C-alpha cells in the first residue's frame, strides 16, 4: 500500500537535511526505503500501528543538534530502525543531560 511509500519517501526527505548526505556523498533514497523496511520487519502490521518508529526516525534525522546521526547513515539502517531513545543516544549532549 502507499502508506509505506509516502512515509519512506519522507524518510528519504529527512536524510537529505543539511546536505550532509552530499557532503558524505551517499544516496539517501535507497537508505530511506530500506529504513522503512527495517522498521516494518520489526513492527510487522500492515498499517504500522507503531509508526512512531517512522515519524521519530524522520524527526531525529531532522534534529539539528544531532546531525551526526544524519551523517552516520556507519551504523546501517537495520540497527537504526530499532534503537531505544529513538537513536538520540548518539547526540551525546542530550544523553549526558539525561544521565
Partner 1 sequence: HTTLRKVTANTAIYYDPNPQSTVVAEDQEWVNVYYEMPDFDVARISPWLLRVELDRKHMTDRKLTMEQIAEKINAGFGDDLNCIFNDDNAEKLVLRIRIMN
Compose the 3-42 pattern: x for residues touching partner 1 by CB under 8 A, - for all others: ---xx--x--------------------------------
Length of the chain as a residue count = 99
CA distance 39 to 7: 11
DSSP per-residue codes, 33-72: HHHHHHHHTTS--TT-TTTHHHHHHHHHHS-TT-HHHHHH
* Whether the Cβ atoms of residue 51 and residue 32 lie closer than 8 Å to each other: no
Nearer to partner 1, 27 or 65 (CB): 65
43 binds partner 1 per the rule CB under 8 A: no
Nearer to partner 1, 20 or 91 (CB): 91
Nearer to partner 1, 35 or 88 (CB): 88
Per CB under 8 A, residues contacting partner 1 are: 6-7, 10, 51-52, 55-56, 58-60, 62-63, 65-66, 85-88, 91, 94, 97-98
Amino acid at each position: 500500500d502507499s502508506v509505506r511509500l509516502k512515509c519512506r519517501e519522507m524518510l528519504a526527505a529527512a536524510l537529505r537535511t543539511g546536505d550532509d548526505y552530499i557532503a558524505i556523498g551517499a544516496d539517501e533514497e535507497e537508505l530511506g526505503s530500506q529504513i522503512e523496511e527495517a522498521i516494518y520487519q520489526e513492527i510487522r502490521n500492515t498499517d504500522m500501528k507503531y509508526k512512531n518508529r517512522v515519524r521519530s526516525r524522520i524527526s531525529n534525522l531532522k534534529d539539528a543538534k544531532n546531525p551526526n546521526l544524519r551523517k552516520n547513515v556507519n551504523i546501517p539502517p537495520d540497527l537504526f530502525a530499532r534503537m531505544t531513545a529513538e537513536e538520540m543516544a548518539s547526540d551525546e549532549l542530550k544523553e549526558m543531560r539525561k544521565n
